[PDB]
Write a protein that binds this ligand. Sequence first.
Ligand SMILES: C[C@@]12CCC[C@@](C)(C(=O)OP(=O)(O)OC[C@H]3O[C@@H](n4cnc5c(N)ncnc54)[C@H](O)[C@@H]3O)[C@H]1C[C@@H](O)[C@@]13C[C@@H](CC[C@@H]21)[C@](C)(O)C3
Ligand SMILES: C[C@@]12CCC[C@@](C)(C(=O)OP(=O)(O)OC[C@H]3O[C@@H](n4cnc5c(N)ncnc54)[C@H](O)[C@@H]3O)[C@H]1C[C@@H](O)[C@@]13C[C@@H](CC[C@@H]21)[C@](C)(O)C3
Ligand SMILES: [Cl-]
Ligand SMILES: [Cl-]
Ligand SMILES: [Cl-]
Lengths: 488, 512
Amino acid sequence: QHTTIGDVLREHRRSHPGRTALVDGPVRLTWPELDDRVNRLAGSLAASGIGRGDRIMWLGQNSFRVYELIAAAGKLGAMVCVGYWRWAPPEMEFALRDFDPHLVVWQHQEIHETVARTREALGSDDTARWLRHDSAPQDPDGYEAFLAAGGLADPDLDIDPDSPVLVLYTASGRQCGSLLSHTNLIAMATAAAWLGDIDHTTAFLNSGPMFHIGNHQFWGMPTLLMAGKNVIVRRVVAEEVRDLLVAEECTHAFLMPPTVAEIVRLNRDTGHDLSRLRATVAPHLWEGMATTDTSRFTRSGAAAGRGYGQTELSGFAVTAAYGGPAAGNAGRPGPGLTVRVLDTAGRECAVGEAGEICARGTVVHRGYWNRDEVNAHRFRSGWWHTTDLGRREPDGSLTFLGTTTRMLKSFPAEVENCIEQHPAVREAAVIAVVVLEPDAGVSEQEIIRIASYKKPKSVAFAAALPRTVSGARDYDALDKEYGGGGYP
Amino acid sequence: ALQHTTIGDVLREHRRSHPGRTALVDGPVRLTWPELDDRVNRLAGSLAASGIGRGDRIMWLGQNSFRVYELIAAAGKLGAMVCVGYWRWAPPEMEFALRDFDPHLVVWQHQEIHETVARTREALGSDDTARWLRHDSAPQDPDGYEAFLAAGGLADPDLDIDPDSPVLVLYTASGRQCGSLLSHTNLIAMATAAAWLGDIDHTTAFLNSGPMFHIGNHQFWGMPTLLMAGKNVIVRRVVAEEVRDLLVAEECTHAFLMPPTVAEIVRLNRDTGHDLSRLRATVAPHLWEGMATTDTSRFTRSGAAAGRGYGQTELSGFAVTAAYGGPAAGNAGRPGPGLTVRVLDTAGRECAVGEAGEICARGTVVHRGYWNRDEVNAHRFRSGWWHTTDLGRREPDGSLTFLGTTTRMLKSAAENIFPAEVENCIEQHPAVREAAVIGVPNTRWAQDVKAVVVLEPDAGVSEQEIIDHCRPRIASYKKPKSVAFAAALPRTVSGARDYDALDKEYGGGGYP
Ligand SMILES: C[C@@]12CCC[C@@](C)(C(=O)OP(=O)(O)OC[C@H]3O[C@@H](n4cnc5c(N)ncnc54)[C@H](O)[C@@H]3O)[C@H]1C[C@@H](O)[C@@]13C[C@@H](CC[C@@H]21)[C@](C)(O)C3
Ligand SMILES: C[C@@]12CCC[C@@](C)(C(=O)OP(=O)(O)OC[C@H]3O[C@@H](n4cnc5c(N)ncnc54)[C@H](O)[C@@H]3O)[C@H]1C[C@@H](O)[C@@]13C[C@@H](CC[C@@H]21)[C@](C)(O)C3
Ligand SMILES: [Cl-]
Ligand SMILES: [Cl-]
Ligand SMILES: [Cl-]
């Protein structure tokens, strides 16, 4: 009987009878209050037929209710998919038909237009109960009234913690729902508690999106595991965030640089105490208004990106924080993971040789929802295949080179990377389009470590790279411009 | 979906991630992680060629050695388990242990215990079917561990081992000894929690000066060191200058040391120049008189280093500590990750706040059971809870208090009393150093509560003043009839309380 998420809540209610667990605007909950609510919720779920292996889709922004649902589903051996709130109806429809939830918890604010249309496209296939979460607390088709109708008795079920409990859709087109078990999350949060020096006094601002692994690992689940206080913001607004930092005495946040600079300018000279916040990302941009984190997470450079990982490995499973100075850009595996770089023929690559990053261990997810064939192939031979490219340095460390999905017939990323190991190059795209540093300047011929055949026969130069509306690299934009066709 | 991490995986990852880091030192033996994994693979090879596979059993009958780690890992790569037996076992219990555990293989030691060994084999007679390999042998002894190992090939066994299966067995002593079956998962979880408590990493150098037959040395800090790829330095026995020199030579950050050795180290190192400043002092920091660096980890800061905790072998060690959850009214603190706890009454209903009952547990640190104890395991695991046979209570602030044992009980017309409850509340009195409670026959159905009280040398207190002290925290029907005073409680040669002796001295009897 291994520890489940349910056990974690049942222990914190007895061990921390008066400490704040969740805060969400006006709502505040101690661990007892939360466990009672999770028990009510789990009562009404078991009432509506939800049990082992059943499925729930959250369709909204960040909410304290996400944590509650996860716990309740966990206590029944069910799973919650925290879906993408910005999905247009085609994608939203796809996920619904894919994940096939028995119940859909949804948000009116912001997306009701899209939600409404999508249900109409589903028509008579929409055999799921929908509860509005941001409803008036009386609403009969409402979350709060769904929960209140349940009783306080913990269902006390013997749940296999290897059963999935959190499903994250991972984003070459098609989206797939990664199955993260109770064990995946607890193994992740214990690792993370060591990286961050996280404890019961940790107050963490959930300003990162819960539809994605980032916010969960740093630091949602570890804060939760160690009994810290998780504070929820629906949206990131610099003023409100800055305000919560003071009010909840927050020690950690999930903040991106543009937000931070917004808080800095805005807080300057007003004298509010932001010194309790341990800043992880880009410490200098705070100027000193907050305290520079000295946990291994920041010290090592993992906070700035020194690491490798993915949703399917419960997030950031390899960092410069495990094992010390590393020549490679990602560091080494933390505990609960073993990695090997494998070539085409499934054999271990030699030191320096590039291949696919493959993993086994406790942090490796359970597979994708409803992807039998992709799972069989990705789990071949008792290794999870990440589809990412890497190599081992002689010092032991690992280097993340890029993806293996983008391919050229006899890998681009491998050379994209080699090219970006020129001081004059800022970034490169190989199909070899090149964006140079503003100050440097170098010959196409100097550009042209790798093998006789792998080098391209041409190098264009751009002011920057094309990019999608999300801001990620846009390749099919410049497959056109520079002659890109014939792809295997 | 694939298996969880094993002990074999840990080694496999370290040999790739830390090719030149030192893993094990033992006298002149030094081993980087690749050198250790190749050794383990050879040993695993010869173990498999001898017929050792899943479920099979190896007994170590010796003091601390680097080879012990080698066996654990090698047995773990085959799905086998290693029992680290008590080297100071006398022949009768060496036999019992060998009969009970029934290993296919015995790795034994000649220095200091050979005679005992010789006597025990004689006693086993023609049920002594195991292969015996001498660890500290002449290096070309064919019945010696080194040559047995060198017969193995370098290939990894590369089996799909279930990490829930036992890999380490520690005997825990009524006087009945039982082998606690600890899985790969038990030790990795323990190790992972310990890494957070003591801030352990790859730079850790832990001197293995505690005994490896006991969970202590493993939790602090053998296994977390191993897990985070740090250096493990072994010592066979605990002699202070040896220890002193090895702290200096190997630059250890950590060592397992009780206060008697600390005090002798501090004398011998008195004006020598020797640098012990690397050592982070966890036990009795003041005793070093500045010579080592007081530990700032959560382990020391919380009092957990000084015994503010609760646990046992069956929970993979110290699983409840003041380091988990901050300041605590109870003496034990709170459960770590990997563990939930409840205080259950005699009917199995959960006691109320402040009410004394059996400490019971669930979670990842809980052991797989005792080896070869079907009826007891079935009883001790009743209801999906591990019953610890320890008595405690939850406090108003959610912290836990370890009161003592439930193995002793007094007869009562109301409901059987736990002497450990009364003992504890008497031991609260600030003038009392220790208290022991026995039962005096009072008809067939009950015994009188009799207290034997050891005072602090400079304190006064009457029988009545002690009795009065308990009134508010224990029920009327539990309070003692009489109090006797002693200079010290009698003990065994093991230094455990001798309740048999007290019974005798003050007319105790008529227990359940
Ligand atoms: C979110 C984190 C942690 C989990 C992995 C990851 C990568 C992520 O976005 O997960 P994913 O989208 O589900 O899938 C991952 C896919 O991204 C590629 N990748 C792998 N390691 C990478 C790295 N080192 N850089 C950039 N890309 C990387 C690879 O091809 C893989 O398949 C990171 C991005 C990372 O910049 C941060 C965001 C933020 C919080 C933690 C990480 C932080 C502190 O600023 C760092
Ligand atoms: C060894 C450690 C860690 C593992 C648990 C334990 C207790 C132990 O010795 O395990 P065991 O041989 O299986 O005995 C278990 C039986 O001990 C009783 N017990 C429970 N919590 C206790 C506590 N708080 N005090 C005294 N006794 C306690 C109870 O009845 C239980 O069943 C400790 C004793 C502890 O004094 C230390 C030794 C040393 C290293 C770590 C711990 C250190 C830093 O000084 C602390
Ligand atoms: Cl396969
Ligand atoms: Cl001898
Ligand atoms: Cl009373």
